[PDB]
Amino acid sequence: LVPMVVEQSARGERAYDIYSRLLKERIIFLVGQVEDYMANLVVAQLLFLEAENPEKDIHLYINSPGGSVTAGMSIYDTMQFIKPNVSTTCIGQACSMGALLLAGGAAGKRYCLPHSRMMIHQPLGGFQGQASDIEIHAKEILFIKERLNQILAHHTGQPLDVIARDTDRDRFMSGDEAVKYGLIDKVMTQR
Amino acid sequence: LVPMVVEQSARGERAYDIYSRLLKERIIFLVGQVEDYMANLVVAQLLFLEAENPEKDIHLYINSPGGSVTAGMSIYDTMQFIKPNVSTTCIGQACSMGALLLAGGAAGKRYCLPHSRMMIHQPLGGFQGQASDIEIHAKEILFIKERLNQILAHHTGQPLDVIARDTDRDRFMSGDEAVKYGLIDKVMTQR
Amino acid sequence: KLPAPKEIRTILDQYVIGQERAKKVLAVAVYNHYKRLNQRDKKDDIELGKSNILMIGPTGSGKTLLAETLARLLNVPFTIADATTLTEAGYVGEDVENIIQKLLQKCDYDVEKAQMGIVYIDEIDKISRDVSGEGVQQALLKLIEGTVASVPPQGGPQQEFLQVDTRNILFICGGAFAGLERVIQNRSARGGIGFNAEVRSQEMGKKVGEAFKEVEPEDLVKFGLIPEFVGRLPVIATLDELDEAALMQILTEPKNALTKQYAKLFEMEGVDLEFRPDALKAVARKALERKTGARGLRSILEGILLDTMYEIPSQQDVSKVVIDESVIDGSSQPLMIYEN
Amino acid sequence: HKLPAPKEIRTILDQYVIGQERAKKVLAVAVYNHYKRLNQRDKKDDIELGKSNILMIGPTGSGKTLLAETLARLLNVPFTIADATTLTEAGYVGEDVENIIQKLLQKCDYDVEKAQMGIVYIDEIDKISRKSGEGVQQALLKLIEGTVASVFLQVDTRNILFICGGAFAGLERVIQNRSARGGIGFNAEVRSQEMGKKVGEAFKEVEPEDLVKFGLIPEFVGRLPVIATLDELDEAALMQILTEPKNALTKQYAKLFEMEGVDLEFRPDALKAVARKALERKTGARGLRSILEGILLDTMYEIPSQQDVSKVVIDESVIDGSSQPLMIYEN
Ligand SMILES: Nc1ncnc2c1ncn2[C@@H]1O[C@H](COP(=O)(O)OP(=O)(O)OP(=O)(O)O)[C@@H](O)[C@H]1O
Ligand SMILES: Nc1ncnc2c1ncn2[C@@H]1O[C@H](COP(=O)(O)OP(=O)(O)O)[C@@H](O)[C@H]1O
Ligand SMILES: [Mg+2]
Ligand SMILES: [Mg+2]
């Protein structure tokens, strides 16, 4: 069950859930598989925080094993479009979309806990139909694979030939390895 | 869970869900498969906002893989009937029915994010029965197909023959491609 | 002395532009009110009760102007006390007594003048529905119908307090009841939403054209006002919204028209102030969007005149300053005949 | 009455005040009209025009008094600067409201000729805000109406121009409420976290309504058809003011060192940094005093300790707070 929290503001006492209280501090949580419904909540949260303070930074915690590519793109495109710098902090796992959203944070604001694990693999897809339909969908999944590799290269600075080579198979990277790779900037250890 | 939000208005403080708070700004969200239950909410929301300010524009975000043709028609017919301009900003994906709503927005107010995929496909129908019923149910799915082609030609401006040719098979169009096609007016990247 | 209602109407019409409905109401209202103070003979006819008026109009409609202008026709003490300041006894805030106190300060502490005074309590709508609500209304109820004054002495014991009965004074009440249009819309054709609905024309100064014409006591009670309070005020005047057609007829027609006043100042230096028909209309539209109406004309005009009002004196031989529609907006500058 | 043209008024006043020329433009024509118009109305057609009272609203150390003084520096007619706190009930609890007219009797020289054109000015009118309080406002408003009242010497109250100016505390917050906020969208204009934080919300655009909301008597609030808007300060104007007065801060600093026989050498470069410190403390022109007073404390405790300290050179490092005064002590 979600616990309740009391802010105890000067005007008076208010009761907010644990998640809503943190949202007041420009914090957004990404938990579970990425899908259209949960992804829409993140988009709404990002826009709302923008209006409250378009200058203050935002912190997006990412703990997900991946999910829908389209849902993830709606978040990534929203993070870059808005004015505030959306920080990113890995809290243990990012398989396919978690690393794209972890590496799509403002420069100097991508963190990772000491024992977090980050992976990167090519987008998986499933479709059935006629040969003509298969050829059409095959080109679409090949186009997406290229656009995703371009995003990582831009934020990480590595050449596209290396990204494509590393995304052919599942590649696990620790906190220290990710810094050299360019996925993140700093590894938070202690306060 | 849906996080709560406080407006902190002069009259006082009220708690609004993340979706309700944006609704006050004349914003409606269309997520998931299109169906009678979800589509009816959009109808009520569009009509409700008309009374508050029949002059201020409305922003309808579309991220849906399609659904019921009848449910979608109630939304399109409602958007055109009301006086306010209904802007469209496609985030994520916009399949056959989703693309129709994206194209039904006011002129010059249709948008889409960079990594947005807009697909167009024929209407999907299924029916079982005697030959007489099949012949009767075949004219309806064929007549509906003509209405949807005319709608796209009207907003996009392309000739009807091109719409029928393109709708025969799945055609994925990016932001830039959709602008030339007339489906949208501008591709937004950064504020 | 007791001028015919028609004469009052014509005099008030000089400034007010299009308040005929309220004009007549306000005219007859005061006319009979002062006839009571006049008809003081002892013939079993002193029982006559006063009838207070309840002016309802959108902000800037002209409510205050009517009250102020009419005050001059009476040539007696008049005052305007806001309703927000007043709060029920037992908590910090202005006391109902204070209304009489300030009212008497204008009267010079003359009992005869006090009884023959008029009040214009504003923002009555604010006090609707434990504190600042029914409490204030309950206190005010007695005051408006009948009460003795307790105004402390000015300058200079506790017995020094003066008294006067609040049973003659006409307590007019003006208020911009926001939302009353929806209450009156519920009377007939309640539909706000839907295809076959009465959806509001717009969110500009067109909305309340004649929406208060059908105002009844029941709606005011539903609004929040106490039933007794609504009963106290039998007359309910109604004012228009002063839309663009009104604002065009108010910038030159009134005797105190801004154009006239501005022209007078310009005429001294020798510049013949001129305005274009479309130019004046342009200002009206700018004021409506700004939501400042009457009060926006002066400011808007000062932003279009002051600029050249600082130059014109230093310039000589100036004969005319043509104000074009373009000049009103931020595209052109006031055309001026630098030489003859 | 001096009564010059708006051009002359602004130009002659600019000589002593820098940065307040925007408001000047308005006030220039404003006072120009009042004197000319009233004095020689010649029974103008449909006379409606009321006394052209001008409001003055600016924060502390904005040069309200300076603009009031410069305005009264060349004005031959009296100005009778007065206060709003000093006023109390009419000789019941303390000072009476006739004291404003009493200050006029001193400046007018008991001359009715001067009294009628007396420019009654008040400062810090924002300290009588309703919450004595509202009573003083009403007793004050009575004279604003132009009601002839003796103090004893009969005084002409008609045609008295009011340029009263108060440092209203919490004025921007009230006009900030009137300002609308941005939306929450992908194609919407969020303009700022807050709206009255980039420009002075109060002194850019004001309407009588905003003043009534503040908690002032509506009659007095709608008694002045004209208004003004004072700009707190300017970065460029802060370097000029540093040495513009006859006894400017920097000048006085050097003069104080000169009493002992030391020269206060100062660098142009340092000046720029100094302006920023004042702009950050946001205490007005007077605020700058504290910055240098502290900075000089070390120099005010080093020059005395070491005798024969010919001069002292201040560099940008000293204002940064790292460098120590470069003592030029020699022979
Ligand atoms: N516009 C200005 N130009 C030059 N100096 C100024 C200006 N405004 C303030 N000052 C400086 O402020 C000092 C005097 O402050 P003063 O007592 O006039 O504050 P004030 O503006 O009257 O305060 P308030 O606005 O509350 O009345 C002088 O040393 C003067 O140099
Ligand atoms: N028809 C009109 N002619 C001239 N002035 C008007 C007119 N209507 C409104 N005003 C001006 O608008 C101001 C506001 O008063 P009013 O409209 O009565 O109510 P409120 O003060 O609540 O806006 C008045 O000072 C008046 O000068
Ligand atoms: Mg008014
Ligand atoms: Mg001073």
| Number of alpha carbons in the 13 Å side-chain half-sphere of residue D223 | 20
Amino acid identity, position D329: Y
Q: If we measure between CA atoms, which residue out of C72, C81, C127, C122 comes closest to residue C103?
A: C81
Binding pocket residue ranges, ligand 1, CB within 6 Å: D 17-20, 58, 60-66, 123, 167, 241, 245, 285-286
Question: Closest-CA residue in chain D for C121?
Answer: D218
DSSP per residue over C1-15, as a string?
A: ----HHHHHHHHHTT
Beta strand A15-17 with A4-6: parallel, antiparallel or unpaired?
antiparallel
Phi first, then psi: give them for residue C193, nearest 5 degrees.
-110, 150
* C246, C65 Cβ separation under 8 angstroms: no
Q: How far is CA D276 from the centre of its chain?
A: 22
**What tokens appear for D228 in the block?**
């003004």
* 3-class DSSP state of A4: strand
Q: Which ligand is nearest to the CA of C12?
A: 2
* 3-class DSSP state of B8: coil
| Number of alpha carbons in the 13 Å side-chain half-sphere of residue C14 | 13
* C220, C213 Cβ separation under 8 angstroms: no
SS (H, E, C) chain D: CCCCCHHHHHHHHHCCCCCCHHHHHHHHHHHHHHHHHHHCCCCCCCCCCCCCCECEECCCCCCHHHHHHHHHHCCCCCCCCEECCCCCCCCCCCCCCCHHHHHHHHHHCCCHHHHHCCCCCEECHHHHCCCCCHHHHHHHHHHHCCCCCCCCCCCCCCCCCCCCEECCCCHHHHHHHHCCCCCCCCCCCCCCCCCCCCCCCHHHCCCHHHHHHHCCCHHHHCCCCECCCCCCCCHHHHHHHCCCCCCCHHHHHHHHHHHHCCEEEECHHHHHHHHHHHHHHCCHHHHHHHHHHHHHHHHCCCCCCCCCCCEEEECHHHHHCCCCCEECCCC
Binding pocket residue ranges, ligand 2, CB within 6 Å: C 15-17, 59-65, 242, 250, 254, 294-295
Which residue is associated with the tokens 């030159």? C252
DSSP per residue over C15-36, as a string?
A: T--S-HHHHHHHHHHHHHHHHH
* A137, A127 Cβ separation under 8 angstroms: yes
Q: For residue C274, give the H/E element and its range.
A: strand C272-275
What is the C-alpha separation between C239 and C211, in angstroms, rounded? 10
* C56, C180 Cβ separation under 8 angstroms: yes
Cβ burial B145-163 (10 Å sphere, 16+ → b, else e): beebbebbbebbebeeeeb
Question: Closest-CA residue in chain A for B6?
Answer: A24
- By CB atoms closer than 10 A (0-12, 13-18, 19+), residue A20 is buried
Cβ burial A128-141 (10 Å sphere, 16+ → b, else e): eeeeeeeebbeebe
| Number of alpha carbons in the 13 Å side-chain half-sphere of residue C286 | 21
* D48, D219 Cβ separation under 8 angstroms: no
Which residue is associated with the tokens 């609203």? D57
Phi first, then psi: give them for residue A91, nearest 5 degrees.
-115, 30
* Chains contacting D (3 or more CB pairs within 8 Å): A, B, C
Contacts of B115 in chain A (CB under 8 A): 73, 76-77, 147
**Residue in C65, C242, C252, C253 to alter for ligand 2 test, most ligand atoms within 8 A of Cβ:** C65
What is the C-alpha separation between A100 and D296, in angstroms, rounded? 56
List the alpha helices (DSSP H) in chain C: 5-13, 20-38, 63-74, 96-107, 111-115, 134-145, 180-187, 217-223, 227-232, 244-250, 258-269, 277-290, 293-309, 325-328
Show which residues of A are catalytic. 96, 121
Beta strand B117-120 with B171-173: parallel, antiparallel or unpaired?
antiparallel
Q: If we measure between CA atoms, which residue out of B81, B117, B74, B115 comes closest to residue B99?
A: B117
What is the C-alpha separation between D15 and D18, in angstroms, rounded? 8
At CA D155, angle to CA D150 and CA D156, rounded to 5?
A: 135
What is the C-alpha separation between A88 and A104, in angstroms, rounded? 8
**What tokens appear for C35 in the block?**
């006839």
* D192, A54 Cβ separation under 8 angstroms: yes
Q: Tell me the nearest-neighbour CA distance from B28 into chain A, angstroms.
A: 11
* B56, C203 Cβ separation under 8 angstroms: yes
SS (H, E, C) A72-88: HHHHHHHHHHCCCCEEE
Method: cryo-EM
Task: Pick the atom of ligand 1 nearest to D289's CA.
Answer: 29
DSSP per residue over C146-199, as a string?
A: S-B--PPPP----TT----BTTSSEEEEEE--TTHHHHHHHHS----SSTTS--
* B79, B49 Cβ separation under 8 angstroms: no
Q: If we measure between CA atoms, which residue out of C309, C291, C298, C205 comes closest to residue C256?
A: C298
* C57, C176 Cβ separation under 8 angstroms: yes
* Chains contacting C (3 or more CB pairs within 8 Å): B, D
What is the C-alpha separation between C211 and C63, in angstroms, rounded? 16
D271 Cα–ligand 1 center, Å: 19
* A120, A156 Cβ separation under 8 angstroms: no
Q: For residue A90, give the H/E element and its range.
A: strand A86-94
Residue B131 DSSP class: H
Residue A172 DSSP class: E
Q: If we measure between CA atoms, which residue out of C335, C331, C311 comes closest to residue C323?
A: C335
Show which residues of B are catalytic. 96, 121
What is the C-alpha separation between C198 and C182, in angstroms, rounded? 11
* C127, C176 Cβ separation under 8 angstroms: no
Q: If we measure between CA atoms, which residue out of C122, C95, C126 comes closest to residue C224?
A: C126
**What tokens appear for D2 in the block?**
């001096």
Nearest to D218 among C80, C105, C314 (CB): C80
Which residue is associated with the tokens 């660098």? D267
Task: Pick the atom of ligand 1 nearest to D249's CA.
Answer: 29
Q: Tell me the nearest-neighbour CA distance from D55 into chain B, angstroms.
A: 28
Q: Which residues pair with A5 in a beta bridge?
A: A16
Nearest to B63 among A23, A47, A74 (CB): A74
